[PDB]
């Protein structure tokens, strides 16, 4: 940042009637979340050319990423492994995300482990 | 012919002894399954060498990101979860004042 | 147990003299003796409130369900929050030799090391290092040495050519723990 | 790498090329006719850090040497690719050390033969 | 507290500028080469002395006729010695102790003596005369620029009365005219002769040898200050001078008794009698593993009988030892007196490890008497230049650094290159640890050497030739700065009257000759 | 050795500041002035 | 709120008597230890960790007395500790560094850290960097004060403490308020530019997890000033 | 990549005048400025690196970052010990010293008769 | 500043003097958003949707 | 004793302790249950000596003499070169669908795909192991002419290498050479004309 | 990789994937946008 | 770091290969005599 600072500041002592631009190219970590942008099978119904008309961009599509719920309610007959099965997790995972709760009653709100399929 | 040297002979006994030694220096490689103590196959000697060379030189992506953030001060967040992946990237842009 | 481990790692593995007497006093058999002990060794932190804070973990009350998990937690926290504890838990480190520059200059990187009376028995009686002209000096390329010169005879080479600087290489540190351990090993072998 | 760098460049005030033993006395030469014989230097006087009364080289009219800490520039010799002689301290710990193949088999002072011996 | 005001002074560049401006280009101080066509950046600067003139005392202050040429050739010899050093791997190591340095220098010496001096490398600084080795020899004497036969003689022999003035015969029966590179040890052997001492201006060495330095009294006074001391204050001054003189001279006495602390007898000890130098071997006991030492001249028969592998074990006094792998050394027997008025017999080697009672910084002072103390032989040009090399290596001014395109890469330059490893499995390339190598050819011109730049290089190990990425090559830097970091700085002969100097405008470089 | 004896007491005092290198002015106290100034004032006669 | 000044001023509260007491109690302590230990019979008292602990206590106190005693830590106390046979701990070395650095002796402080780095590296706490920072600031070498901070940002461990950030920032304000000589004073006071480092340092303190609200009220006034000189947002 | 062809960050300053020689001489000015400032910064970084090379601990955090994988290349959760990790770190620092030295050494090439920017 | 010939006798610096660069650079503020620190992540949902 | 020689080879303190245990037990059980001469104890001391020598000689001759010639190993680089050459010749065994898991092939391939492949620093034991393995491989990779004798490991591994061998006689002594040339020129000049 | 190349057509060259994010007036928002498109494109390419 | 780099003002860091301003430019405008030889 110190070099960058000297460099941005050379604009104050530049020669007469001369200006400048600063191009920067730096390296930066990006993060690809398979949680937010999951890789899934193509839908059971496909998408036509018809979802691509003009203004389809404004009408037929949401902005990516899609919102996938991180919270699920436990049904009556359900159990730890039944809930894990319904959500697509290992039971271990579902217990770690929910660590506060030891046992799960019907009609209780639960955290869905982010890796769930 | 004074400069010419005899190519030494290395018996499997020696090789397996040295391999135990390696295993006892780096226990974690036997745990994590980099090398096996056993020398059975003809190519096993070479194979373990190659596994070692890979373990030492191949940097796991999360580690790579962390290392680059330390001394080169590379900014960006860095994901430690298995479902995240650290992509080294560039950003170009302009400034004018 | 920490004291014990540190004393073993000192020698690189028997037990060193390090562990024999530690900074922690043994606790008297009473409630008030306990509170007094906690007070005087760990008392820069507030110990009581830490023991309270460490009670619940993720809604689960530890004190009334898992006793040893709770215990280890409260212990570990009081450990982390005191500076006094940090001080009394330190690992014994080797002792750094002060040095002076060579009398016949060859390397600026080669220095004459000081030797504590423990490392050289015999030898003429010496003062303390600073009084003798030794200083703290070290760098990546430092090398330490015991400096002396070859005895010149009666010959041409003695009169005309310069003195010949014989160096003998020495470590820059002194492991007091290893010296003690190995000397007691000698005493258990002799006996 | 001048001879007596310290004494001349770092030690002396003129960098060796200013003549500090010169009298500011009036000369009969035509170029020096402006030069007027100077009063003698003031006795107990407190100078400004960049000036002196001009008596000696140790006390110039103009103090050239900085009053800060001086440090020789960081050597551009590679420290990581250079292999020094093995020390006592290094050879005791040789069994924990991580070297390059060039460090173990080095032409001068190979460390593998030491690990073995 | 003084540092509360920051005073940067005036930067050296600004000073030099004001000087050369005030002198209207200061032509008195410029090398004569500044006045000839296309001076390189080194001719562009002022006339300061560099470190290269330091060990040559033949030329005193005014060098006489041909002396400066002789010196110039000595200087070259050293540059070549450095080149050989880099080539074969013996150069100063920043870490090195004294025995290591001793060994290293020794090998370098042997390799110097067997290598021919290269006259192509020799260049002439402004105004200097070109002079052949033959002319130099016949003027200054052959001992000065010795032929290998002469060197061999001096190193193998004894006598003083021979300083070799004229050439020597050779195995083919001719006069050996060969100039090999000069060597530290040869010049030391010359420093032993009285005649040579006189020739190089060190004659004083003979008179001064055992003696003390002349006492230096702190705050010693002129007569003109002393004239104002009252009788009592003058008594005090005398007391002071007396005490300093006595203290110093006594300190020198103690120093030159050369007493060492013997640990076994818990006493100081002192050397009365020297024996001659015996070759000695080590014998290890078979049963106990004990270690003994033996005169090889006494046991010669049996030892040689073991060297022939016939009877492999040496019996002495019913205790039998095995001869060690090498353990052949040259030691001197010493009779060491003890403060009890006692006598011991001790090897040179063992008495050497012992600890001195007096180890003053000024111990070598006699060798340059009244000039500063030196730990090396200053009368030896090669050894001095070598010592400077090691100093500058220790301090990070010299050593292996990543090469630039400006550093003077050329045929013959020693180099450390990261040896390319070839795998088909590798896209791009594989680098391996730096190895010693020489440059075979390096093209400067961009159109012969497109990016990334290459260097053709012959690796010293197996003699293998390759192109290497210039980013993989390291050169031995002489200084921090550059552009040419590889070549040394050359002092130029001093000119008393500088304004009168003449350039021939038609042939500025003296090409018609 | 023995607690609070002569030698221990001496080593507590530290390094001895030489009276030569002391810079005392007219009042017998160390100077206000910068070292370069004081040095010049007290320099030997010629 | 300056940590260095606090040592210096503490020295003026009966520093000599507290020192003498400390030495006395230290000897009392060594006697008591030798009693409690009664193989390693010969080095049993010095060998024990307790002995090391006590020696450290002695040093940590002597810092608080006058100049004389501070100067005596890296000289006599440490030598006597070597002589006695008592092995040191990381806090021994950091106290010796803090002593050397209050004295302004940078070469030796940095030496000790070098030795540590080389042999004992895994044990180095932040307080050695703190020692060095305080020291360089005292010797008024601000480029070193900077070098050591930048290094401590590169290795991100040990973790910088609010005290560290405080010492570095203070050293910057100190730098910014020094004058140059008259030659450079004709147009303006140059050294103000240093204050303009500050909004960079503050940004680093957020990357490092050093909470910016542990900084003395005093320093935070100077810093807030420094900010209002050079910092502005894209809005303004 | 090695030598000239590789870096963490690139800055391009695009200077613009109304007259060609203006912009040429500005470029010499700014260039020599960045040469000096660059050498100062990169030298500082270089001393930091040489110190980190000489020795140091490992973050608990950096170790944790090497050890977050459900499976490594050898098909199981892999245990990097602090040693190995320190070795990765060390290797990168090595490379950074080469690069720093390369930049510094080119800062020192362009002297007055010889300058080609 | 010691150079009495500065514009009068024809001396014009080819390189802008260090002291001047320092003054110039010390007069103006530095923009905060130029410092470029991102340690959290990218905000997918909320960032592009923020208050009008 | 034979067991001890082989097994504890690379940590020597451990070996000393085990020899001491073995022979001190042999000495207990030797003292009582034996009879009228002291020759037994001499024989056990002689067994400590024999064992020690057998081990020291085992690591001298089979390790230190193998590895100590550093030029022959091309100062560690020949060692690396061989390695890659070996992995080249044997790919259908090391990196192949039947040979190894996709993960490992990916990691290999990934290490090899970088702009510069830098060779990893390595622990002493590992250094030894690597060196030994590569000596053994070098044996097979080389032409049958060079298998037994050559100068350097890597010799003959890559066919196309241009060396600098060019001087046949320069290594020879000057005197011999000289006399030869004088005699031969004396004959050529005094014999024929052309 | 084949799927990545076919999905982002002229947005790959010399084996470098390059997205130019112009959508929003401010650079900050364009790194947000650009980063999103990148992970969305990787998410789809990864279907292979 | 420091606003004005050590290299500028510290004589330890003095660059011996730098030359003064006047010298190079005087040397440069030199036009040496074109008749170096007879005949041409």
Automatic annotation (TrEMBL), chain A:
Domain of life: Eukaryota
Signal sequence annotation: none
Residue span, LysM domain: 73-113
Protein name: LysM domain-containing protein
Organism (species): Trypanosoma brucei brucei (strain 927/4 GUTat10.1)
Gene name as annotated: Tb05.45E22.300
Automatic annotation (TrEMBL), chain I:
Gene that this sequence comes from: 30M24.380
Organism for this UniProt entry: Trypanosoma brucei brucei (strain 927/4 GUTat10.1)
Top-level lineage group: Eukaryota
Name assigned to this protein: Uncharacterized protein
UniProtKB/TrEMBL annotation, chain J:
One annotated GO molecular function: RNA binding
GO cellular component, one term: cytoplasm
GO BP, sorted A to Z: mitochondrial RNA processing; mRNA stabilization
Highest taxon of the lineage: Eukaryota
Protein name: Uncharacterized protein
Record organism: Trypanosoma brucei brucei (strain 927/4 GUTat10.1)
TrEMBL record, chain L:
Protein name according to UniProt: Uncharacterized protein
Gene that produces this protein: Tb05.1P6.750
């Amino acid at each position: 940042t110190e070099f960058e600072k000297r460099m941005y500041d050379i604009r104050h002592w530049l020669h007469r009637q001369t200006s400048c631009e600063f191009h920067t190219i730096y390296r930066r970590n990006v993060i690809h979340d398979s949680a937010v942008f999951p890789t899934e099978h193509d839908p059971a119904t496909p998408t036509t050319h018809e979802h691509h008309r003009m203004f389809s961009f404004a009408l037929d599509w949401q902005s990516a990423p899609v919102n996938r719920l991180s919270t699920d309610t436990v049904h009556e007959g359900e159990s730890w492994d039944a809930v894990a099965q319904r959500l697509g997790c290992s039971v271990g995972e579902l217990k770690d995300a929910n660590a506060e709760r030891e046992t799960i009653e019907a009609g209780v709100v639960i955290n869905v482990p982010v890796t769930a399929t | 012919n004074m400069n010419v040297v005899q190519r030494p002979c290395i018996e499997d006994g020696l090789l397996s002894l040295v391999l135990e030694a390696v295993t006892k220096r780096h226990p974690n490689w036997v745990k994590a399954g980099v090398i096996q103590t056993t020398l059975k196959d003809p190519f096993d000697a070479l194979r373990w060498m190659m596994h070692i060379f890979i373990r030492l030189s191949y940097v796991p992506h999360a580690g790579a990101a962390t290392i680059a953030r330390l001394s080169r001060r590379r900014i960006g967040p860095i994901g430690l979860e298995p479902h995240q992946f650290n992509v080294p990237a560039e950003l170009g842009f302009v400034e004018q004042y | 147990q920490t004291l014990q481990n540190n004393a073993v790692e000192a020698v690189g593995a028997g037990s060193a003299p390090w562990s024999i007497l530690g900074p922690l006093t043994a606790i008297g058999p009473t409630a008030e003796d306990t509170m007094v002990w906690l007070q005087q060794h760990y008392g820069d932190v507030d110990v009581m409130s830490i023991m309270r804070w460490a009670r619940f973990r993720k809604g689960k009350d530890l004190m009334a369900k898992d006793r040893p998990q709770y215990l280890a937690r409260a212990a570990a926290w009081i450990e982390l929050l005191s500076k006094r504890n940090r001080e009394m838990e330190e690992v014994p480190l080797t002792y750094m030799r002060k040095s002076k520059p060579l009398v016949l200059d060859t390397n600026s990187n080669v220095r004459v090391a000081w030797q504590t009376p423990l490392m050289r028995s015999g030898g003429p009686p010496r003062l303390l290092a600073r009084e003798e002209g030794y200083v703290f000096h070290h760098s990546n390329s430092s090398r330490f040495v015991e400096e002396t010169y070859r005895h010149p005879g009666e010959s041409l080479q003695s009169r005309y050519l310069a003195l010949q600087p014989l160096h003998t290489e020495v470590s820059a540190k002194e492991d007091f723990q290893r010296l003690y351990y190995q000397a007691q090993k000698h005493h258990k072998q002799q006996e | 790498q001048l001879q007596a760098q310290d004494r001349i460049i770092c030690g002396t005030h003129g960098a060796g090329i200013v003549a500090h033993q010169t009298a500011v006395n009036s000369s009969d030469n035509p170029m020096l006719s402006s030069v007027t014989t100077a009063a003698p230097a003031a006795d107990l006087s407190r100078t400004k850090p960049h000036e002196g009364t001009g008596t000696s080289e140790r006390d110039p009219y103009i103090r050239t040497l900085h009053n800060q800490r001086s440090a020789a520039p960081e050597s551009s010799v590679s420290q990581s690719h250079t292999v020094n002689a093995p020390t006592v301290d290094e050879c005791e710990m040789l069994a924990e050390r991580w070297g390059t193949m060039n460090y173990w088999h080095n032409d001068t002072f190979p460390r593998l033969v030491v690990f073995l011996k | 507290t003084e540092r509360n005001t920051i005073h940067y002074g005036v930067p050296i560049q600004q000073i030099v500028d004001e000087f050369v401006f005030r002198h209207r280009n200061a032509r008195g101080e410029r090398p004569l080469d500044y006045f000839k066509p296309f001076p390189n950046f080194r001719a562009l600067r002022l006339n300061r002395m560099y470190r290269d003139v330091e060990g040559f005392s033949l030329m005193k202050q005014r060098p006489e006729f041909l002396e400066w040429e002789l010196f110039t050739r000595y200087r070259q010899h050293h540059q070549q010695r450095r080149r050989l050093a880099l080539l074969h791997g013996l150069e100063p190591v920043a870490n090195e102790t004294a025995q290591e340095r001793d060994t290293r220098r020794h090998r370098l010496d042997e390799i110097c003596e067997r290598t021919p001096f290269d006259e192509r490398e020799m260049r002439v600084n402004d105004d200097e005369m070109r002079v052949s080795v033959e002319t130099l020899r016949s003027w200054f004497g052959v001992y000065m620029l010795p032929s290998p036969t002469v060197v061999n003689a001096v190193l193998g022999g004894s006598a003083s009365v021979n300083l070799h003035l004229y050439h020597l015969a050779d195995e083919m029966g001719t006069a050996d005219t060969r100039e090999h590179v000069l060597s530290s040890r040869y010049l030391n052997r010359l420093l032993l002769l009285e005649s040579y001492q006189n020739r190089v201006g060190r004659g004083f060495m003979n008179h001064v040898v055992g003696r003390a330095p002349e006492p230096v009294v702190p705050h010693e006074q002129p007569q003109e200050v002393l004239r104002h001391f009252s009788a009592e204050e003058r008594a005090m001054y005398e007391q002071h001078v007396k005490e300093q003189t006595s203290r110093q001279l006594g300190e020198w006495e103690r120093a030159m008794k050369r007493r060492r602390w013997l640990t076994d007898h818990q006493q100081y000890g002192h050397v009365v009698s020297h024996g001659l130098e015996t070759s000695v071997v080590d014998l290890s006991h078979t049963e106990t593993g004990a270690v003994l030492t033996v005169s090889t001249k006494a046991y010669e028969q049996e030892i040689e009988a073991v060297r022939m592998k016939t009877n492999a074990t040496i019996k002495v006094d019913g205790m039998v030892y095995n001869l060690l792998p090498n353990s052949e050394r040259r030691v001197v027997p010493l009779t060491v007196q003890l403060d009890s008025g006692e006598k011991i017999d001790m090897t040179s080697e063992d008495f050497d490890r012992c600890e001195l009672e007096a180890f003053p910084r000024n111990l070598n002072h006699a060798l340059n008497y009244g000039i500063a103390n030196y730990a090396y032989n200053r009368g030896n040009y090669v050894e001095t230049q070598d010592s400077i090399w090691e100093e500058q290596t220790a301090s990070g001014q010299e050593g292996w650094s990543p090469a630039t395109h400006a550093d003077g890469l050329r045929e013959g330059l020693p180099v450390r290159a990261r040896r390319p490893i070839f795998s088909s499995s590798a896209e791009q390339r594989i680098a391996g640890g730096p190895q010693r190598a020489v440059i075979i050819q390096y093209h400067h011109q961009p159109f012969f050497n497109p990016e990334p730049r290459l260097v053709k290089v012959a690796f010293q190990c197996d003699g293998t030739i390759m192109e290497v990425p210039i980013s993989d090559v390291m050169i031995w830097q002489r200084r921090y700065h550059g552009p040419e970091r590889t070549v040394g700085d050359e002092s130029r002969r001093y000119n008393p009257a500088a304004m009168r100097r003449y350039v021939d405008v038609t042939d500025p470089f003296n090409e018609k000759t | 050795d023995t607690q609070n004896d002569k030698k221990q007491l001496a080593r507590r005092l530290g390094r001895y500041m030489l009276f030569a290198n002391r810079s005392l002015d007219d009042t017998g106290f160390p100077t206000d002035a910068r070292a370069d100034d004081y040095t010049r004032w007290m320099a030997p006669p010629s | 709120c300056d940590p260095a000044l606090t040592y210096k001023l503490l020295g003026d509260e009966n520093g000599e008597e507290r020192a003498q007491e400390a030495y006395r109690w230290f000897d009392l302590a060594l006697t008591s230890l030798a009693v409690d230990c009664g193989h390693f019979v010969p080095y049993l008292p010095q060998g024990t960790a307790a002995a090391s602990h006590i020696t450290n206590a002695l040093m940590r106190t002597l810092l608080t007395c006058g100049y004389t005693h501070v100067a005596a830590i890296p000289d006599s106390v440490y030598d006597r500790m070597g002589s006695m046979g008592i092995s040191p701990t990381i806090s021994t070395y950091e106290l010796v560094m803090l002593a050397l650095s209050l004295q302004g002796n940078m070469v030796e402080a940095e030496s000790i850290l070098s030795f540590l780095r080389s042999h004992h590296s895994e044990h180095i706490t932040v307080e050695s960097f703190n020692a060095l920072l305080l020291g360089h600031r005292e010797a008024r070498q601000f480029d070193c004060c900077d070098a050591i901070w930048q290094e401590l940002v590169d290795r991100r461990w040990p973790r910088a403490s609010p005290l560290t950030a405080e010492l570095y920032l203070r050293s910057i304000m100190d730098h910014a308020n020094t004058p140059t000589s008259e030659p450079l004073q004709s147009f303006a006071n140059i050294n103000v530019v240093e204050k303009k480092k500050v909004p960079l340092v503050l940004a680093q303190m957020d990357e490092l997890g050093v909470p910016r609200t542990h900084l003395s009220r005093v320093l935070m006034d100077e810093v807030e000033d420094s900010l209002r000189k050079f910092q502005t947002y894209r809005s303004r | 990549e090695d030598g000239i062809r590789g870096s963490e960050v690139t800055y391009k300053i695009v200077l613009e005048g109304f007259w060609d020689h203006h912009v040429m001489k500005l470029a010499e000015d700014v260039c020599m400025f960045l040469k000096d400032v660059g050498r100062q910064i990169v030298e500082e970084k270089l001393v930091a690196v040489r110190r980190l090379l000489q020795g140091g601990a490992v973050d608990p955090e950096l170790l944790a970052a090497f050890n977050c994988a459900r499976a490594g290349p050898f098909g199981g959760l892999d245990e990097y010990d602090k040693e190995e990790v320190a070795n990765f770190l060390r290797s990168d620092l090595r490379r950074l010293e080469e690069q720093c030295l390369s930049v510094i050494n080119r800062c020192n090439v362009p002297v007055p008769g010889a300058t080609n920017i | 500043s010691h150079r009495r010939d500065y514009i009068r006798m024809g001396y014009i610096p080819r390189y802008t003097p260090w002291e001047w660069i320092a003054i110039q650079e010390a007069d103006q503020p530095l923009i905060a958003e130029q410092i470029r620190q991102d340690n959290i992540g990218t905000s997918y949902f909320f960032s592009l949707n923020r208050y009008w | 004793a034979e067991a001890a020689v082989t097994k504890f080879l690379f940590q020597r303190g451990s070996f000393e302790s085990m020899l001491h245990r073995i022979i001190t037990d042999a000495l207990e059980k030797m003292s009582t249950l034996a009879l009228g001469g002291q020759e037994g104890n001499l024989a056990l001391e002689a067994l400590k000596r024999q064992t020690l020598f057998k081990r020291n000689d085992y690591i001298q001759k089979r390790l230190i003499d193998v590895v100590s010639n550093s030029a022959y190993l091309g100062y560690g680089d020949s060692v690396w070169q061989v390695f890659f050459a070996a992995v080249e010749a044997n790919e259908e065994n090391l990196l192949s669908d039947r040979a190894t898991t996709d993960a490992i092939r990916a990691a290999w391939e990934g290490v090899m795909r970088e702009d510069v492949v830098r060779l990893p620093d390595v622990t002493g034991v590992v250094a030894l192991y690597l060196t030994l393995v590569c000596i053994r491989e070098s044996g097979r990779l080389v032409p049958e002419e060079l298998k037994e004798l050559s100068s350097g490991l890597e010799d003959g591994v890559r066919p196309g290498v241009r060396k600098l061998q060019q001087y046949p006689l320069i290594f020879l002594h000057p005197t011999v050479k000289r006399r030869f040339v004088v005699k031969a020129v004396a004959e050529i000049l005094h014999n024929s004309s052309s | 990789e084949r799927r990545l190349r076919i999905l982002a057509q002229h947005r790959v060259g010399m084996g470098v994937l390059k997205l130019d994010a112009d959508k929003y007036e401010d650079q900050a928002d364009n790194v947000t946008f650009g980063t999103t498109k990148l992970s969305e494109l990787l998410a789809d390419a990864r279907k292979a | 770091s420091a606003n004005i780099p050590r290299s500028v003002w510290d004589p330890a860091q003095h660059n011996p290969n730098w030359s003064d301003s006047y010298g190079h430019d005087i040397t440069n405008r030199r036009a040496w005599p074109a008749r170096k030889w007879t005949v041409g």
